[PDB]
Structures are given as structure tokens and as C-alpha cells.
Design a protein around this nucleic acid. Structure first.
Ligand SMILES: [Mg+2]
Ligand SMILES: [Mg+2]
Ligand SMILES: [Mg+2]
Ligand SMILES: [Mg+2]
Ligand SMILES: [Mg+2]
Ligand SMILES: [Mg+2]
Ligand SMILES: [Mg+2]
Ligand SMILES: [Mg+2]
Ligand SMILES: [Mg+2]
Ligand SMILES: [Mg+2]
Ligand SMILES: [Mg+2]
Ligand SMILES: [Mg+2]
Ligand SMILES: [Mg+2]
Ligand SMILES: [Mg+2]
Ligand SMILES: [Mg+2]
Ligand SMILES: [Mg+2]
Ligand SMILES: [Mg+2]
Ligand SMILES: [Mg+2]
Ligand SMILES: [Mg+2]
Ligand SMILES: [Mg+2]
Ligand SMILES: [Mg+2]
Ligand SMILES: [Mg+2]
Ligand SMILES: [Mg+2]
Ligand SMILES: [Mg+2]
Ligand SMILES: [Mg+2]
Ligand SMILES: [Mg+2]
Ligand SMILES: [Mg+2]
Ligand SMILES: [Mg+2]
Ligand SMILES: [Mg+2]
Ligand SMILES: [Mg+2]
Ligand SMILES: [Mg+2]
Ligand SMILES: [Mg+2]
Ligand SMILES: [Mg+2]
Ligand SMILES: [Mg+2]
Ligand SMILES: [Mg+2]
Ligand SMILES: [Mg+2]
Ligand SMILES: [Mg+2]
Ligand SMILES: [Mg+2]
Ligand SMILES: [Mg+2]
Ligand SMILES: [Mg+2]
Ligand SMILES: [Mg+2]
Ligand SMILES: [Mg+2]
Ligand SMILES: [Mg+2]
Ligand SMILES: [Mg+2]
Ligand SMILES: [Mg+2]
Ligand SMILES: [Mg+2]
Ligand SMILES: [Mg+2]
Ligand SMILES: [Mg+2]
Ligand SMILES: [Mg+2]
Ligand SMILES: [Mg+2]
Ligand SMILES: [Mg+2]
Ligand SMILES: [Mg+2]
Ligand SMILES: [Mg+2]
Ligand SMILES: [Mg+2]
Ligand SMILES: [Mg+2]
Ligand SMILES: [Mg+2]
Ligand SMILES: [Mg+2]
Ligand SMILES: [Mg+2]
Ligand SMILES: [Mg+2]
Ligand SMILES: [Mg+2]
Ligand SMILES: [Mg+2]
Ligand SMILES: [Mg+2]
Ligand SMILES: [Mg+2]
Ligand SMILES: [Mg+2]
Ligand SMILES: [Mg+2]
Ligand SMILES: [Mg+2]
Ligand SMILES: [Mg+2]
Ligand SMILES: [Mg+2]
Ligand SMILES: [Mg+2]
Ligand SMILES: [Mg+2]
Ligand SMILES: [Mg+2]
Ligand SMILES: [Mg+2]
Ligand SMILES: [Mg+2]
Ligand SMILES: [Mg+2]
Ligand SMILES: [Mg+2]
Ligand SMILES: [Mg+2]
Ligand SMILES: [Mg+2]
Ligand SMILES: [Mg+2]
Ligand SMILES: [Mg+2]
Ligand SMILES: [Mg+2]
Ligand SMILES: [Mg+2]
Ligand SMILES: [Mg+2]
Ligand SMILES: [Mg+2]
Ligand SMILES: [Mg+2]
Ligand SMILES: [Mg+2]
Ligand SMILES: [Mg+2]
Ligand SMILES: [Mg+2]
Ligand SMILES: [Mg+2]
Ligand SMILES: [Mg+2]
Ligand SMILES: [Mg+2]
Ligand SMILES: [Mg+2]
Ligand SMILES: [Mg+2]
Ligand SMILES: [Mg+2]
Ligand SMILES: [Mg+2]
Ligand SMILES: [Mg+2]
Ligand SMILES: [Mg+2]
Ligand SMILES: [Mg+2]
Ligand SMILES: [Mg+2]
Ligand SMILES: [Mg+2]
Ligand SMILES: [Mg+2]
Ligand SMILES: [Mg+2]
Ligand SMILES: [Mg+2]
Ligand SMILES: [Mg+2]
Ligand SMILES: [Mg+2]
Ligand SMILES: [Mg+2]
Ligand SMILES: [Mg+2]
Ligand SMILES: [Mg+2]
Ligand SMILES: [Mg+2]
Ligand SMILES: [Mg+2]
Ligand SMILES: [Mg+2]
Ligand SMILES: [Mg+2]
Ligand SMILES: [Mg+2]
Ligand SMILES: [Mg+2]
Ligand SMILES: [Mg+2]
Ligand SMILES: [Mg+2]
Ligand SMILES: [Mg+2]
Ligand SMILES: [Mg+2]
Ligand SMILES: [Mg+2]
Ligand SMILES: [Mg+2]
Ligand SMILES: [Mg+2]
Ligand SMILES: [Mg+2]
Ligand SMILES: [Mg+2]
Ligand SMILES: [Mg+2]
Ligand SMILES: [Mg+2]
Ligand SMILES: [Mg+2]
Ligand SMILES: [Zn+2]
Ligand SMILES: [Zn+2]
Lengths: 69, 181, 53, 77, 110, 141
RNA sequence: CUGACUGGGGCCUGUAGAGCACUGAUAGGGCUAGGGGGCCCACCAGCCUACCAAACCCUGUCAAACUCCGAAGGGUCCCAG
RNA sequence: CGCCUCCUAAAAGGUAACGGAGGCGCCCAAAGGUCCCCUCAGGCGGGACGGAAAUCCGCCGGAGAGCGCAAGGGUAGAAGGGGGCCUGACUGCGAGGCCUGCAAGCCGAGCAGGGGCGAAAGCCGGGCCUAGUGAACCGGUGGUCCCGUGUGGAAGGGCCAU
RNA sequence: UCCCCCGUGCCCAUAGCGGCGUGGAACCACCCGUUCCCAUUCCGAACACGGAAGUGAAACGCGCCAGCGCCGAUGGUACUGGGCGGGCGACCGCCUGGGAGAGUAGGUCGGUGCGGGGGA
RNA sequence: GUUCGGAUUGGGGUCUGCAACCCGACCCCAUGAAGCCGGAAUCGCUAGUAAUCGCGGAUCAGCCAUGCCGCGGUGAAUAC
RNA sequence: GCGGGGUGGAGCAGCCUGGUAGCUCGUCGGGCUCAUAACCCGAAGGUCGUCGGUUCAAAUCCGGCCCCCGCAACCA
């Protein structure tokens, strides 16, 4: 490479909020992230976060079977 | 040269599994990465504040490599464009710096992305190459909220040595690209 | 040759004689022309300078 | 009734000046042309307006080298 | 459909012929470096020299300088003195520059 | 009626009418044809007259093929002017037609239906004509 | 003896004719963006088109200022009458 | 009404009309010299803001792009695009020819002076080319130190340049 | 004197597009590195250097196939130099010498010079 | 454009009523619009008044009442 | 035949000197008035006669066609 135009690469410490640490190289020796590959919802198989909804509607009402027949 | 995780992972896990699925008879027949090119079609800096050392300083931190200018090929009325006007940046990553960038890209960037639901399956060249877009450069780890004046994403082109989308798809998924469908 | 594209001379900066005549666009090139040319008097090259025609 | 036309230019008398097998002196003009219809070959100069002329005393020869164009030569006598 | 290698090759070679000299054309491969002096008026090679024919050693650059002093050595024996350097697609530098300088010390004129 | 939709040049020199046709000399589409026996500039006004006549016989039915087209611009100086002051103005368009061309071909019609419209068509033309039907010679070109 | 003309030989040319490869023109057919039209929609797509019609392919044609071709001739130089 | 391009023009050159069409009366200090490197328009596919069209990746694409400006010719085996160093957009000449009634117009190898680029072979006396122009008379201006009306100067003229 | 490869020419698509197959001992290429010379409007991609673990995957070279491209007769015609007739013309004929273009048959998946390196 | 402002909507509940789709009120989670003091123009009030604050009642199952009829708390400026 | 011209609904600018469409009236919504006018406050509407070309870009520069105004059309 040309000298004096290039940011310098060093061993880097990317930290996640799950406590995943990643061994890599970067222009900054230490970085923290909010999220990573090791914990993300879409990422971890199909960990369907806050909603394992299945909708639930619309057959789902069912309140109740008390209307007469 | 540098030992890094993805570069290592390619030879160790990606290489053999690929030779499995498609049964190549030559080591060079099997899919490789050649280059990842990063681009910022910018052009918001056509006239206005054609001082984009702020984004060249950005891209230089993201990739550890000084971007080059792109300039207008032809003048355009509707775009307010003088021929030769400075309208974008482009850095070409090969070899070690290519891996290191993809490494941070796959492990960090795409996760930090707004409502990420997987890379687009269909952005495949037809000749086995792949392209994707970013709305924000904050998506990376080396760019804090502080050091930015404005939102500026980018174009990302990854070239394979593959011939079909299918070998390309496999090479990239095996490396660690998250596809929705 | 025009109103903006003027004619001019080059004066040898050493012996002060004019040995070459040419033109320029005085809007595109407001400074005086400076060029090295063979001066037939000094018998060598000399910086020649644009002077009024 | 009137014409918005009327004009044309002076003819320029272009073309080959010396044909193959003709004896020429150094300097003789061989071909007058607009662009390189013919190309200078051995012993043949080309001037700023494409004019092919002989560099040595001798005899003219033409050669048609396909996609390489047509060439004029002078062979020393 | 030509390539930069091919075009550059013609580009310098065409300018060399026009000056009518004998051409000292140089081939440089990954291992070896060859050189032949050609009379283009006959389509004919008049003298040659190559590392591969001289069975020479290691350092490509010194190897070049040596195949150079060689080519001249055989050359002056045939009366050849004036000649012109065909740097082909190769930038005048490194291995090729070295062969050239070898030819010069040998007394070949250019 | 027929005329070019646009052209590189507005006015065309007159030229000649020597020789038999260069082509157009064999039946190519329909069942019967009308062929020119002598040279002429056939005007668009005649071609349309001849065409209309043929559709007028058929009423409902048939298909008419026009194999000539008026692309040559026709010039005339304004009435009562003297020679000079430039070329006349374009006033109409003509089809340059030499001996042996098929100008019109018909299809989808009885033979008497075709002989007759081609005949009636023929009267509308400034030249002599011969009616011909498709032969293996036509087939073989 | 070098001339008009003539014989052989080389080189030069873009006409007659022809051709549609380029620039344009061009009739019908195929295929098919774009619109127009008729169904169904405003949830945004769809379907039919004896409608006008790009580009492409086919058949068939036109051109002083079109040429993938291309004569007979003509010009010039050498040797000879 | 002068100049350039095309056709008419009958395949050398030339060729008329109040025949058919267009352009010029500029421009560039780089759009010049040279060394080094580079290859277009367009089509399909892929890509945040991004559109028919900005910039990015791939594949096909001999030239349909580009070459300041009209047209023709030429041209990527560059005359097109980028960069470095530069001013040959030279002084003194010019063998030999194109064209041609004259006068003009044009092309030019080579020798010398002093230079520019190049390792060099070499190239360079402006520009891919063909328009961008005006003979002489009269005078202005810088230089030259040639004549100077008895003599020394001067006045005024000659010569080179504009 | 024959075969293969590396150079460098000539002929200027009968040499090209596509498809299939083949070659790594040798040569060539990719290749292994980026210390050094040198280099990127960023990138050792290019150019360049020092190399020799692998591979003929890309490239290249060598063969095969006529789908495209390219070449293409014989015959006949158009036209025509010169010589004659015919028509009021537009135009049309005969004689002698010359003779296309289209198309048809058909050919083509190159030939050859010189110098190197290897093999018989 | 905020701990200002509380429209718009999404989701979930209570109640009245035979019945709240058109078409009720209320509660809760989330959404958090216009609006930075209002163009030409124009209204009310002379003292316990104007301004500001809450409370009740009639109608009435519930209620689209921010309307109306009353009631007190605090409480001015100014009239040449 | 020569010169000038076509721009919201009416009538004129902008064109020469390419990038930006303006003025008065009129229309529409509001205000004053019992009401109307006038007057006051806001607001809509020209894709520049066409088709072609030059340009990076055309109301503007160049060509074609169309319609309008003015002048000419003489010795005969
Ligand atoms: Mg895809
Ligand atoms: Mg960030
Ligand atoms: Mg690929
Ligand atoms: Mg008139
Ligand atoms: Mg006129
Ligand atoms: Mg004329
Ligand atoms: Mg003339
Ligand atoms: Mg003339
Ligand atoms: Mg002419
Ligand atoms: Mg000629
Ligand atoms: Mg020259
Ligand atoms: Mg020149
Ligand atoms: Mg020959
Ligand atoms: Mg020769
Ligand atoms: Mg040979
Ligand atoms: Mg005539
Ligand atoms: Mg007539
Ligand atoms: Mg006429
Ligand atoms: Mg008229
Ligand atoms: Mg006339
Ligand atoms: Mg006329
Ligand atoms: Mg008519
Ligand atoms: Mg005909
Ligand atoms: Mg008749
Ligand atoms: Mg045919
Ligand atoms: Mg004699
Ligand atoms: Mg003679
Ligand atoms: Mg003679
Ligand atoms: Mg003769
Ligand atoms: Mg003809
Ligand atoms: Mg055509
Ligand atoms: Mg065809
Ligand atoms: Mg004709
Ligand atoms: Mg012609
Ligand atoms: Mg012709
Ligand atoms: Mg001939
Ligand atoms: Mg002639
Ligand atoms: Mg002759
Ligand atoms: Mg002859
Ligand atoms: Mg004789
Ligand atoms: Mg003049
Ligand atoms: Mg001519
Ligand atoms: Mg001619
Ligand atoms: Mg001629
Ligand atoms: Mg002449
Ligand atoms: Mg004019
Ligand atoms: Mg420059
Ligand atoms: Mg240049
Ligand atoms: Mg330069
Ligand atoms: Mg492209
Ligand atoms: Mg695209
Ligand atoms: Mg988009
Ligand atoms: Mg785009
Ligand atoms: Mg071009
Ligand atoms: Mg220097
Ligand atoms: Mg002379
Ligand atoms: Mg003369
Ligand atoms: Mg002249
Ligand atoms: Mg020198
Ligand atoms: Mg030097
Ligand atoms: Mg010279
Ligand atoms: Mg230029
Ligand atoms: Mg010029
Ligand atoms: Mg001149
Ligand atoms: Mg006088
Ligand atoms: Mg006079
Ligand atoms: Mg004087
Ligand atoms: Mg004196
Ligand atoms: Mg005196
Ligand atoms: Mg004294
Ligand atoms: Mg004296
Ligand atoms: Mg004195
Ligand atoms: Mg004096
Ligand atoms: Mg004096
Ligand atoms: Mg002078
Ligand atoms: Mg070879
Ligand atoms: Mg060979
Ligand atoms: Mg092949
Ligand atoms: Mg193999
Ligand atoms: Mg192969
Ligand atoms: Mg090997
Ligand atoms: Mg092996
Ligand atoms: Mg190695
Ligand atoms: Mg280093
Ligand atoms: Mg070292
Ligand atoms: Mg490398
Ligand atoms: Mg292979
Ligand atoms: Mg190669
Ligand atoms: Mg075969
Ligand atoms: Mg041929
Ligand atoms: Mg043929
Ligand atoms: Mg024949
Ligand atoms: Mg005759
Ligand atoms: Mg005949
Ligand atoms: Mg005959
Ligand atoms: Mg015969
Ligand atoms: Mg012919
Ligand atoms: Mg033939
Ligand atoms: Mg073949
Ligand atoms: Mg050999
Ligand atoms: Mg051998
Ligand atoms: Mg807000
Ligand atoms: Mg309700
Ligand atoms: Mg709030
Ligand atoms: Mg607001
Ligand atoms: Mg505030
Ligand atoms: Mg308030
Ligand atoms: Mg208020
Ligand atoms: Mg008021
Ligand atoms: Mg009161
Ligand atoms: Mg109550
Ligand atoms: Mg109540
Ligand atoms: Mg309500
Ligand atoms: Mg209340
Ligand atoms: Mg108006
Ligand atoms: Mg004006
Ligand atoms: Mg203006
Ligand atoms: Mg109103
Ligand atoms: Mg009113
Ligand atoms: Mg344009
Ligand atoms: Mg505008
Ligand atoms: Mg326009
Ligand atoms: Mg336009
Ligand atoms: Mg107009
Ligand atoms: Mg009058
Ligand atoms: Zn994590
Ligand atoms: Zn001097």
C-alpha cells in the first residue's frame, strides 16, 4: 500500500452485550456493540422474541361455546 | 500473512463442504472470493458542500483503506451535474482486508441494522456474484454516533469465482450470510 | 484573434528585444506569458516575457 | 423566388501523384489525401496533412495488406 | 478483442520497426528471460540468447544482466553493433532493464 | 394516400427510366398479379384510385397487396414563373416503375373476381398492363 | 524519334449494373415494450384486443447527397511499333 | 458576391446553372512537445437515498462512441482518456515536389545554432485533417547602427520584427 | 529431415463466434510471498520484484463438430468499350470484344518463414 | 414541537341497554397530529364587573354537555 | 417577395445575452355593507402555435409546416 494515506490495522476487541467477544482486526483496538451474530432474534435459529403469536385470531375467539344449540 | 477467522473458516469448513455438494475435480474449480468493492454513490456532494473527506475519513476507518474518488462521466441537467464533478467514493478490498471487513460485516453490521430480516436471496448476479445496500454507515462498529454529521449508507459488491448463483449462494451462506428466503 | 483573444509579443528578458509574436486568451490566462525561447541575439534560451503589442 | 443554397468549395485535387513502377526522387509527393487512405511504408514519410512523399530516390510500390490498410513504398534504385 | 498486454505490445513494437533498426526483442517469463535480435526486413532472426539455453543460476535480475552480456558477446562476432531495444509489454525496469544494461556493457550500441 | 413519413432529403433529381425492373418481377404473395408493360412514374393518386377500385369490386372479401410505393418526390415550379430562382416545390409523390414489376397482387377470391378487379384497376393506370397468375416459376424464385 | 494512335505490363478509381451490411425509406406477416379500447378493480395487480404501434425476425422493395459488392472503360508510368 | 464540406460530376484530375444541402469570419497556455500508462457507445443482470439517465459489480459488445465547432475522410495496433516533465506555438536554411495563367496556396526529408521529453530507437519548426481570411500603397511601434546633401552630429529615411 | 512447446514474423476471417475434448516431464501460465527495485487518482487487480509447495481450474497451445460468421465456382443474366439499326418519344434491338452483383453447387473449425528448448 | 399540546389511529377491557356495524360514554396499553399566539376583519365587559376556577340541576337507560340554567372561590385595568 | 409576430381567460413583458416565466385586469375563496359595486386580505391557472434539430439543459438558438400584422408587387 501507499504510506500516509492509510489508517493502520491492529488486533481488535469487539465486545457484545451478550458478552460475546470477537477476535479480529480493526482501526480501533476496542469496540462495544449493542447486538451481534451470537444473540440476534432472526439469527438464533428462530427465537421468535416477544411474539410466538400464531396470530392468535381469528377462529381463536372461543368465548364461548355457550351460545345455544 | 494474517490469520483471521473467516479466512481460516473458508479453507477449513467452507471449502470441504463445497467440494461435497458440487463435486469439483480441481481445487481451483471450487468457488473463491476475489474482491469486495465498496461504493458510495453519494452525489449529494455534487455542488453544495463537495467536501466529503468526512465520508472518506469514515470509509477509511471502516475498511482500513483509503477510498478513491468517482467523478461524473457525463454532464446531467436534471441532476445538476458538471462532467468530471466529484460525486462519489470507491474502495476495492482484496485478500486479507477483504476477509477482515466481511468478518466484521457478518458478525456485527447486519445485526445492528434496522429491523434486519435477512439478506436478499435474489440479489444474485446470475453469474454468481452478489450485491447489497446499506442505509447507514452507523451500521458498522468503528463509527460512533458522535463522529457523524449525516446519514450516508453505501453499495457493497462481492465478486466470486463461481459461475452459477447456486455455487455462489452456497459459498456465501457457508461463510455466514443470513438469507430470508 | 478577437477582443478577448489578443495578440502579443515575447520580449527576451535579458536583452529586451522582441523575437516572437503570438496570442493568448487574456481572460483564461490573465498573467503575463512566460516561456523559454531561443533568443537570436543572446544566442541561447532565455525566459521570454509577454509585452504590449 | 430565391435560393438558400448556391455555394460550394474549391476542389482540392487530391489523390495518388505517383503510380507503382514510376521512378521518383527524394522529396517527390506520392499521394495527397484526407486521412490515411494509404499508409507510409519503407522510405515513405507522412506530412501533417497526411501527404505521403518519398524519403529516397527510387521506385514506387503499393501493397494491400488487408485489415492493415494499403501501403506505399519506395525501393532504392 | 485485444487486451492491454496485446495493445501495449504493438504500441511499442510498431514504433521500433519504423526507425528501421535491428530489434533486440526481450521475452520475460516467470522463470526465464530470452532475447533475440531480428531483421524485420527478412522476417528473420540473426542472433539469440536466453537464460534457458545458458543454464543460468538463481537471481533473475543478475541472470538477466548475464544473458545480456551474452547476447552482445555472440553479437559483435557477427558485425552487429547498432540495434534498438524492444521492451515489448515490459516496462523498462527490473529484469528487462538489467538485460539491456548487460547488452550495453557487452558493447552492443543503443 | 401513400407517401413517406419522413425522408433524409426533400427534393430528388429526376433520373432515368431505362431498362426492365431490377426486381419485384415475380408473384410473391397473392394468387394473381398486375404487371407493368412499360416504364412510368405512377402517382400516389393513381395507386389509391386503382386500390380503391379493387376493394370496390370485392365489396366484402379478398386481400389486396400493393408492391409499389411512391417515395420519389415530385417537383413543380409555381404557375407562370420563369426559369430559374431555384428548384420547384414538392407537389406529389411517385413510384418509379419499370417493365416487368408486379404492382398489385390479389388473394382469397375467385379467378373471375380477380381478373376483373385487376382489369378495372388497370384502366386507372397510365401504362399498359398484363395480368398474370402464380406459376411454379414464381414459386421457384 | 522523343508525337497523335496502337501492343504488352504494372499501379490508380467507385460510375453502369446490382445489393440492403451501414444512413434513411418501405408493403405485408410473425413476435412483442408502450399507449388507446373492452371486462374487473382502488387494496394493486390481472385478462381480452378484426386498435394505433418501438425494437427484433421473416417475406418483399426504394435512394444524387446509402454501399457488403462492383464492371466495361478511363488516367498515369515502363518497354515496343 | 470571399472561404470549407457533400452531391450533381458521366470510377484519374477538372467541370456549369438564380441546381440540391450545410457550415466559416473562431478557438486552445493546453485542446501544445514528449515519455508512460489506459480503451469506447450500447445491451442484459445485480446495487441504500437513486430516477430512462449520477456512482458501483459482472457478462456480452471491432467500433455503432470519442476526436471543441459543418461535413467528409480518417482513426482504439489511437488521432480517443489520465499523469509526469516541459515550451520545437524554435533561430539560420532547405534537397525535392503537389497545385497552378500570374500572384498566391500546400507538403517537406536533411545540415547548423541553442533547447524539451526519452534508458534508448527516436520524436518535436503547434493543434487527426481539409474553413477561421486580405496583395500593394500610406503610416504606427521595438530593434538594427546601413544612408546622413561641404564636415562632426542631428532631421529624415533603409533593413529585421510587429 | 519429423514431432511438441516458447519466441517473433508473413498471408489478413478458408485464420472467426459457439460447443466438445486434450496437454503440465519440458516450456508457458496461473501460483507462493510483498523484504528489496518498482507500483495503485483506493487495491501487489495492473505494473514490479524475490520465489517454486500446488494446478492445468483461468489463460494459452493442440484436436474434433459446419448452428452462426467467413470464403465461393460453372452456367446464365445485367451492364458496357467499339461498330450498326428502330421509335414521336419514354425508350428498344442486332454485331464484335469485355463482363458483373445476387443466387446455386460447394469450401472452411487455418497455412507458412526464421531463431530457440525438448524428444526420436 | 418539549414531562408543551392531546387530535389521529392500533390493541385490550368496564357499563347502560333487547340491541352500541352504521352510531354511545368511560377505563387501560401503545400511537403523540396540528399548533411557536393567529391575514383583511371582528366580539364582550364599567366592580365584586371582566378574566380565571371548580360545583350542581333540568332533559335523562346510557349519552355524543366542550350546550343551557344556576352556584360560589379568587379577583383587576380604565373612562381625559 | 422582404420585415415583424403566436406566452394562464383578455391584453402585454421575458427571446437579443439558453438554466430563473413577470405586469394590469379578470376568475375563485374570505372581509366591509341590509345588499351590490368599489375597496381590503388570500389563492388558482401558461407546460410558451406546432413537428424536427443543436445542447448537459431550449419560451430563448437553428430548420420545417401552420395562422396573424405591416410593407412591396414597377417599365407593361
Ligand atoms: Mg437473482
Ligand atoms: Mg455505528
Ligand atoms: Mg462469479
Ligand atoms: Mg417566397
Ligand atoms: Mg435565398
Ligand atoms: Mg448550389
Ligand atoms: Mg465548382
Ligand atoms: Mg475548383
Ligand atoms: Mg468540391
Ligand atoms: Mg487515389
Ligand atoms: Mg509531421
Ligand atoms: Mg497535425
Ligand atoms: Mg505489387
Ligand atoms: Mg516493397
Ligand atoms: Mg518472410
Ligand atoms: Mg432532369
Ligand atoms: Mg407525371
Ligand atoms: Mg418534376
Ligand atoms: Mg408561398
Ligand atoms: Mg429552377
Ligand atoms: Mg421543378
Ligand atoms: Mg403529383
Ligand atoms: Mg419497378
Ligand atoms: Mg391503362
Ligand atoms: Mg430474391
Ligand atoms: Mg521511334
Ligand atoms: Mg512518352
Ligand atoms: Mg506516348
Ligand atoms: Mg496503350
Ligand atoms: Mg443505379
Ligand atoms: Mg438498408
Ligand atoms: Mg437478406
Ligand atoms: Mg436508381
Ligand atoms: Mg453518388
Ligand atoms: Mg450510386
Ligand atoms: Mg481497369
Ligand atoms: Mg471520368
Ligand atoms: Mg490506356
Ligand atoms: Mg494501362
Ligand atoms: Mg518507342
Ligand atoms: Mg476573405
Ligand atoms: Mg467530382
Ligand atoms: Mg466524383
Ligand atoms: Mg472525379
Ligand atoms: Mg493536376
Ligand atoms: Mg450562409
Ligand atoms: Mg494535460
Ligand atoms: Mg491532442
Ligand atoms: Mg502531456
Ligand atoms: Mg456500460
Ligand atoms: Mg444496470
Ligand atoms: Mg432504487
Ligand atoms: Mg442506475
Ligand atoms: Mg465515430
Ligand atoms: Mg527540466
Ligand atoms: Mg522549389
Ligand atoms: Mg505558381
Ligand atoms: Mg487557399
Ligand atoms: Mg538534442
Ligand atoms: Mg537526458
Ligand atoms: Mg525538422
Ligand atoms: Mg485539437
Ligand atoms: Mg484547427
Ligand atoms: Mg493562410
Ligand atoms: Mg494607391
Ligand atoms: Mg489601390
Ligand atoms: Mg513605411
Ligand atoms: Mg553613418
Ligand atoms: Mg552633413
Ligand atoms: Mg563636435
Ligand atoms: Mg560619419
Ligand atoms: Mg546625439
Ligand atoms: Mg530608424
Ligand atoms: Mg534614425
Ligand atoms: Mg516583418
Ligand atoms: Mg507461438
Ligand atoms: Mg506462427
Ligand atoms: Mg474456439
Ligand atoms: Mg485435463
Ligand atoms: Mg483448451
Ligand atoms: Mg508444472
Ligand atoms: Mg504433475
Ligand atoms: Mg513458493
Ligand atoms: Mg514495503
Ligand atoms: Mg531484502
Ligand atoms: Mg501478486
Ligand atoms: Mg484448461
Ligand atoms: Mg498472455
Ligand atoms: Mg469438416
Ligand atoms: Mg470478399
Ligand atoms: Mg456469390
Ligand atoms: Mg460468369
Ligand atoms: Mg454503343
Ligand atoms: Mg441491351
Ligand atoms: Mg454483347
Ligand atoms: Mg463474349
Ligand atoms: Mg458489376
Ligand atoms: Mg459471382
Ligand atoms: Mg472455421
Ligand atoms: Mg519452426
Ligand atoms: Mg528445434
Ligand atoms: Mg411532534
Ligand atoms: Mg352506537
Ligand atoms: Mg408530550
Ligand atoms: Mg409545525
Ligand atoms: Mg417555545
Ligand atoms: Mg393564549
Ligand atoms: Mg389574541
Ligand atoms: Mg384594523
Ligand atoms: Mg353599563
Ligand atoms: Mg340529576
Ligand atoms: Mg347525565
Ligand atoms: Mg361523537
Ligand atoms: Mg358540567
Ligand atoms: Mg394570451
Ligand atoms: Mg428582447
Ligand atoms: Mg437570459
Ligand atoms: Mg372574490
Ligand atoms: Mg360586495
Ligand atoms: Mg445530446
Ligand atoms: Mg427553460
Ligand atoms: Mg425543442
Ligand atoms: Mg429539444
Ligand atoms: Mg419555430
Ligand atoms: Mg399596401
Ligand atoms: Zn451478542
Ligand atoms: Zn536576448
Amino acid at each position: 500500500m501507499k504510506e500516509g494515506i492509510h489508517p493502520k490495522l491492529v488486533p481488535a476487541r469487539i465486545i457484545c452485550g451478550c458478552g460475546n467477544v470477537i477476535e479480529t482486526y480493526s482501526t480501533k483496538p476496542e469496540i462495544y456493540v449493542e447486538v451481534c451474530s451470537k444473540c440476534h432474534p432472526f439469527y438464533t435459529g428462530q427465537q421468535r422474541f416477544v411474539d410466538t403469536e400464531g396470530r392468535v385470531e381469528r377462529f381463536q375467539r372461543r368465548y364461548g361455546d355457550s351460545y345455544r344449540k | 500473512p494474517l490469520d483471521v477467522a473467516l479466512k481460516r473458516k473458508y479453507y477449513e469448513e467452507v471449502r470441504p463442504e463445497l467440494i461435497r455438494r458440487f463435486g469439483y475435480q480441481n481445487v481451483w474449480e471450487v468457488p473463491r472470493l476475489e474482491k469486495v468493492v465498496i461504493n458510495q454513490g453519494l452525489g449529494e456532494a455534487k455542488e453544495d458542500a463537495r467536501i466529503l473527506e468526512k465520508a472518506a475519513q469514515e470509509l477509511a476507518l471502516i475498511t482500513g483503506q483509503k477510498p478513491a474518488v468517482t467523478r461524473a462521466k457525463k454532464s446531467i441537467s436534471n441532476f445538476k451535474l458538471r462532467k468530471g464533478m466529484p460525486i462519489g467514493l470507491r474502495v476495492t478490498l482484496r485478500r486479507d482486508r477483504m476477509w477482515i471487513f466481511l468478518e466484521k460485516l457478518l458478525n456485527v453490521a447486519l445485526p445492528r441494522i434496522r429491523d434486519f430480516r435477512g439478506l436478499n436471496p435474489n440479489s444474485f448476479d446470475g453469474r454468481g456474484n452478489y450485491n447489497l445496500g446499506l442505509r447507514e454507515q452507523l451500521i458498522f462498529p468503528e463509527i460512533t454516533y458522535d463522529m457523524v454529521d449525516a446519514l450516508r449508507g453505501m453499495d457493497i459488491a462481492v465478486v466470486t469465482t463461481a459461475e452459477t448463483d447456486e455455487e455462489a449462494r452456497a459459498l456465501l451462506e457457508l461463510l455466514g450470510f443470513p438469507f430470508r428466503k | 484573434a478577437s477582443e478577448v483573444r489578443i495578440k502579443l509579443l515575447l520580449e527576451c528578458t535579458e536583452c529586451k528585444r522582441r523575437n516572437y509574436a503570438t496570442e493568448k486568451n487574456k481572460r483564461n490566462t490573465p498573467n503575463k506569458l512566460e516561456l523559454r525561447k531561443y533568443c537570436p541575439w543572446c544566442r541561447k534560451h532565455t525566459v521570454h516575457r509577454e509585452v504590449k503589442i | 423566388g430565391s435560393t438558400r443554397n448556391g455555394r460550394d468549395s474549391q476542389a482540392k485535387r487530391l489523390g495518388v501523384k505517383r503510380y507503382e513502377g514510376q521512378v521518383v526522387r527524394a522529396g517527390n509527393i506520392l499521394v495527397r489525401q484526407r486521412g490515411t487512405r494509404f499508409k507510409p511504408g519503407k522510405n515513405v514519410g507522412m506530412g501533417r496533412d497526411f501527404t505521403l512523399f518519398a524519403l529516397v530516390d527510387g521506385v514506387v510500390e503499393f501493397q494491400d495488406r488487408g485489415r492493415l490498410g494499403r501501403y506505399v513504398h519506395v525501393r532504392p534504385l | 478483442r485485444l487486451t492491454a498486454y496485446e495493445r501495449r505490445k504493438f504500441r511499442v513494437r510498431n514504433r521500433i520497426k519504423r526507425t528501421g533498426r535491428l530489434r533486440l526483442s526481450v521475452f520475460r517469463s516467470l522463470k526465464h528471460i530470452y532475447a533475440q535480435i531480428i531483421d524485420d526486413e527478412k522476417g528473420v532472426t540473426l542472433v539469440s540468447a536466453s537464460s534457458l539455453a545458458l543454464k543460468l543460476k538463481g537471481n533473475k535480475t543478475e541472470v538477466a544482466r548475464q544473458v545480456g552480456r551474452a547476447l552482445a558477446e555472440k553479437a559483435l562476432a557477427l558485425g552487429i553493433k547498432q540495434v534498438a531495444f524492444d521492451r515489448g509489454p515490459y516496462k523498462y525496469h527490473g529484469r528487462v532493464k538489467a538485460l539491456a544494461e548487460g547488452a550495453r556493457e557487452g558493447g552492443l550500441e543503443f | 394516400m401513400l407517401m413517406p413519413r419522413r425522408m433524409k432529403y426533400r427534393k430528388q433529381q429526376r433520373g432515368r427510366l431505362k431498362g426492365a425492373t431490377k426486381g419485384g418481377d415475380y408473384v410473391a404473395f397473392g394468387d394473381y398479379g398486375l404487371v407493368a408493360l412499360e416504364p412510368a412514374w405512377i402517382t400516389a393518386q393513381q395507386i389509391e384510385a386503382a386500390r380503391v377500385a379493387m376493394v370496390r369490386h370485392f365489396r366484402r372479401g379478398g386481400k389486396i397487396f400493393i408492391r409499389i410505393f411512391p417515395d420519389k418526390p415530385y417537383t413543380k415550379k409555381p404557375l407562370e414563373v420563369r426559369m430559374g430562382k431555384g428548384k420547384g416545390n414538392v407537389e406529389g409523390y411517385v413510384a418509379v416503375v419499370k417493365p416487368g414489376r408486379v404492382m398489385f397482387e390479389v388473394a382469397g377470391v375467385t379467378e373471375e373476381q380477380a381478373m376483373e378487379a385487376l382489369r378495372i384497376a388497370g384502366h386507372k393506370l397510365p401504362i399498359k398492363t398484363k395480368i398474370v397468375r402464380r406459376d411454379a416459376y414464381d414459386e421457384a424464385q
